[PDB]
Amino acid sequence: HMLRPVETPTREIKKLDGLWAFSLDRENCGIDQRWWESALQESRAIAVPGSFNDQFADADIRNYAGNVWYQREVFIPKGWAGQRIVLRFDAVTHYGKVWVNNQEVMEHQGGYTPFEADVTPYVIAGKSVRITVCVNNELNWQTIPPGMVITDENGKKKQSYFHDFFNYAGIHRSVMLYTTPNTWVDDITVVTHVAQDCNHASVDWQVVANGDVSVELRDADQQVVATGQGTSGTLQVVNPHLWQPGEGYLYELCVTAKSQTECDIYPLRVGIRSVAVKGEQFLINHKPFYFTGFGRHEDADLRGKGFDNVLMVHDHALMDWIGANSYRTSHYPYAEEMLDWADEHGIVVIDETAAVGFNLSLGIGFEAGNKPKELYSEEAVNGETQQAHLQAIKELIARDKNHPSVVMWSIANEPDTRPQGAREYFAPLAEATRKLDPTRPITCVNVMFCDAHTDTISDLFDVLCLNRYYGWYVQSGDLETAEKVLEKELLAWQEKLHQPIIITEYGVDTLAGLHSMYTDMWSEEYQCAWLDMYHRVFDRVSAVVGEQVWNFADFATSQGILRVGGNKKGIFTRDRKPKSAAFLLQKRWTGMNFGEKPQQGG
Template sequence: MLKPIPTATREQLILDGLWLFALDHDDAPEPWRARLDTTREAPVPASYNDVFADQEIHDHVGWVWYQRVVRVPRGWDGQRIVLRVDAATHEGVVYVDDAEVVRHVGGYTPFEADVTARVRAGDEVRITIGVNNELTNETIPPGMITVADDGRRKQGYRHDFYNYAGLARSVRLYATPLAYVDDVTVRTDIEGADGILRYDVATVGAGAVRVAVRDLDGAIVASGSGASGTLRIPDARLWGPGAGNLYGLEIHLVDGDDLVDEYVLDVGIRTVEVRGAAFLINGRPFSFRGFGKHEDSAIRGRGFDAALMVHDFALMEWTGANSFRTSHYPYAEEFLDYADRHGIVVIDETAAVGLNLGLGGGVHGRVTEPAFSPTMFSDRTQTAHAQGVRELIARDKNHPSVVMWSIANEPESVEEGAREYFVPLVELARELDPTRPLTYANEYRGTFHNDRLADLFDVICLNRYYGWYIDTGDLRTAEKKLEEELRGWGRTFGKPIIITEYGSDTMAGLHSVLTQPWSEEFQRDLLDVYHRVFDRVDEVIGEHVWNFADFQTSAGIIRVDGNRKGVFTRDRRPKEAAHLLRARWMDKARVDGDA
C-alpha cells in the first residue's frame, strides 16, 4: 500500500486536529447518522485514554466514535478521492455521511476506501470513525474480556504495555487521477560499483509506465520503461548504517506524451544477507547496537508526535545506537521514513505479542493449557496473524532501513503445536519477501534444547533477564548462566544471535553503593555483565537493551506507573545506564565505521 504523498498529479489533505469524540452508548445505536451528541473533542493523532481526566474513558472497553466535517477541495473535481486511516487500535470502521465505506481489524497498519462516488469536490462531508479496542484469543495481539459483578467489562492481555486505543496516527483525504499507480515493489542488488534496482509497478486504468532514478542533486542516473524491469545505477552511493543515501524513483503513468499520474518513491541501494553466524549489509558484517522501543509518551499514549520522534532518534544517536526493533507492532511509517534518511537499521515486527500462556504482563507463570489449540490460539488467530504479516510487508517492503522481519515476540515455542502454527506464517513471509531474513524474539523457556522454532528462522533473537527475573540481584550467577546459554545456542545452530531484550527495572534517582535491584547502579552493572558475555561469544552480533525509555503498562503491584526498564525516563532524561551505553557504543561505532 503506497503512502499518500503530494506529486505533480496528487494532493492530500491531512485531517489531524480536534474531532468530536464519544463513547459508544446504547441510546445512540447509529451515531454516524447525525452530529455526535457530545461536547468532547479528542486530538488526532493521539490515544484517547490519558487525554481526559475521566476514569470511565481511561478504562473503556469497546467502541468509541470520532467525527469531523470536512470540505473536499474543489480542485479535486474529476479525481479519484480516497479516505485513509493510518491506524485504528484495534478495529476501525469508517462512515462517510450515512454510508459505511471500510472496516478493518488490526491496530497498527493503514486502511483506506475509495470515496469518489460519495463525495463531491467543493462540498462538505461528515466523516465518522468508530474504533474498538477489544482483544480476544482470536486477535493479534490476543487478550481476554471479563465482566465484573457490577457489569463493567474489563480487558485483560498478556503483553506488558498499556492497551492504548484510538486514532493514534493521521487520517487523510487524498486525490489521484482516475488512472493511477497502485503499488510499487523494489528490490536492490550490487554488482561491482553499480547499484541494481529491480522494480514492479501495478497500475489501474490505461497508460504506459516510464521510470527514472534521480540522485540527491536531481540528476537522472537511470531510466527505463515498462511495468517491470531492471535499472543499473553506475557508481551507486549505497544505503547503509550511518549512511542514509537515497535515490528518487520516479514512476510516470503516461498516455503518449501526456502525464497521467506520478508517484515518487525513495529507494536505497543495499543488500542484506545472513552467512553462517554473520549478518551482512552490503557484504560487510553488521553488529546491531540499540534498543527495543515503544511508541509511548505521557498524555498522547501511542499517538504519533514528530517532535518526540526526532528527539528519540537524537538520543539514540547520542548513545551510539545504530538500530532498533519496532517492539511489538509496526510503528508509524514516519519512523521508517526517518530511519531511511538517516541510515538507522530497523527490525520490523508484527503485533503478535502475547501468544504465550506462560507469560502475563512480562512475568513468568505456570502453563495450565496448550497455547495453540482450538479453544485458545486457533486457526482464526493464525489467520489474523497472517493478515498482520501481509499488511506489515505490504506497507514496509520498500524501506531500505528495514533489514529483517520479526513475526512474533515471545510466543510459546516449546509446545508441539507451535511448529504447526508458525510454519505457514514463515512460508508466507518468505513468499512475500524472499530478500530479507526472518526472526522471532524468543523467551527464556525456549532453550537451545527444546525450542521447536529456531531452525525455521535465519537469526536467533533472545529476550533474557538473568539477574532480574531469574536469580534477581545475583550478577555473578547471571553472568555464568547467560554465557552457558549463549554458547549453547551458538553450538547448536551456528546462526547469528541478537539479544533483543536485556535489562532491569530502575527507579530514576535511586542510588546505592551495594548491589541493590531497582537502583541506577544495579541497572548499569547488570548491563555491563551482559556486555562482557556478549564480547566473549562470537555468534552474538547484536544487543538491543530493553528498553529505550520507561513506558506505561496496565496497573499492577510490580508495575508502579509503568515499566521502568528504560535507560531514559518516560520524559527522556538519562539514567546512569545511558552513559554506560554511550561510552561502549560510541567506541564500537568508531571501530565499525558507522559513527
C-alpha cells in the same frame, strides 16, 4: 496495495486537525440508533492523532472497553473535480468503521497499519462532508495481539491481555484525504542486488492501475542516472552510491503512469543495499555488521501511542547522541515517519508485527480472569489466529517492503514454544513470510524460559533473537551466577543453531534517583553493573552480532504488583531524562568503531 501519500502533482488535505467530537458507548447502542446520521450527542473534544485514554485524566475513560465514536465535518476542495479522492487512516487502533454521510466506506481490524477507501462517488467537491468513525479496542483470541474480553454480571467488559504494554487505543496516526488522477500508480516494488560494491541491478516492478510506465532513477543531485520502460521487468544498471548504515544515501525512483488523457508521477525513495545472513554474520552490503541500540515503544505522557513530531525529532537526537545504530519496532509496526527517518539517516531497523502475547506463562499483562489451559488449541490460537497472523504479516510487508532501513521481519515476540502445535502454527507463517518477501532475513524473538534445550521453532528462522533477564527474573541480584548462566546459555544456542545471535531485550527495572552502595536491584548502580556484565559476556561469544537494550524509555503498563507505575527498564525516563546507565551505553557505543563488534578489548 499500499503506498505512502506524497505531494507531486497530487494533493492532500490533512484532516488531523484534532478536536474531533468524541463519545463513548457504554450501552452499546451506537450501532443500533445509527449514530453516524447526526451530530454526536453529549460529546467532547478529542485530539487526533492520539490515544483517548490519558487525554481526559479520568480512569473510567482510560480503562473503558468497547466502542468509541469520533466525528468531524470537513469541507472538500472545489478544485478536485476530475480527481479521484481517497480517505486514508494511517492507523485506527484495533478496529475502525467509517461513515461518510450515512455511508460506510471502509472497515479494518489491525491497529497499526493503514487502510483507505475510494470516496469519489459519495463526495461533492465544494460541499461539507461529515466523517464518523467507530473505533473498537477489544482483543479476542483471533486479534493480533490476542486477548480475552471478560464480561462481568452487569455487562461491563474488562479487557485482559498478555503483553507488557498498556493497550492504548483510538486514532493514533494521521487521517487524510488525498487526490490522484483517474490514472494512477497503485503499487511499487523495488529490489536491489549487490555484488562487491561496484555495479548493481535494481529490479523494478510496478502495478499501475491504468497506464504505461516509464521509470527514471535520480540521485541526491536530482540528475538522471537510468531510465526504463514497461509495467514491470525494469532492471537498471548503476555504478553506485550504496545505502550505508551511518549515511543512508537515497536515490529517487520516479514512476510515470501515463494514459491517453492523464498523467501521474510518484517519487519513491530507493536505498541501494543488500542484506544477507551468511554463517554467524549479518552482512549489510557484504560486510559484517554489529547492531547497537534499543527496543522502543510508541509511548509518551498524555498522547499515549499518539504520533508526534517533536517527540520523534528529540528521541532521534538522543539515539544519535548515545551511539545507537539500530532499533526494533517493539511489538507493533511503527509510524511510517519513523521508517522514513531511518531511511534518510541510515538507521538499521528490525520490523515487527503485533503478534505479542502468544504466551500464557508470564506474570506480564492483565490477569482479570482465568487463562486457557493450552495455548495452541481451538479455544485459543487456532487456525483463524493463524490467518489473522498471516494477514498481519502481509499488511506489514506490504507497507514497508521498499524501506532500505528495514533489515529483518520479526514474525512474533516471545511466543511459548514448548507445547506441540507451536510448530504446527509457526512453520506455515514462517514459509509464507519468506514467500511474501524473500529479500530480507526472518526472525522470531525468543522468550527466556524456552532455553536452547526446550525451544521447538527457532530453526525455522534465519537470525536468533534472544530476550534474556538472568540476574533479574531469575538468579535475582546475583551478578556472578548470572554471568555463568548467560555465557552457558549463549554458547549452547550458538552450538545448536550456528545462526547469528542478536540480543533484542536485556535490561532491568530502575527507579531514577534510587542509588545504592550495595548495587541492589532497582538502583541505577545495578542497571550499570548489570548492563556491563552482559556486555563482557557478549564480547566473548563470536555468534553475537547485536545488542539492543530493553527499552529506550519508561512506558506505561497495566496495573500489577510487578509494575511500579509502568515498566521502568528504560535507559531514559518517560519524559526523556537520562538515567546513569545512559552514560554507560554512550561510552560503549561511541567508543567502538561504527558497525563493528568489539574485539573483546578497547
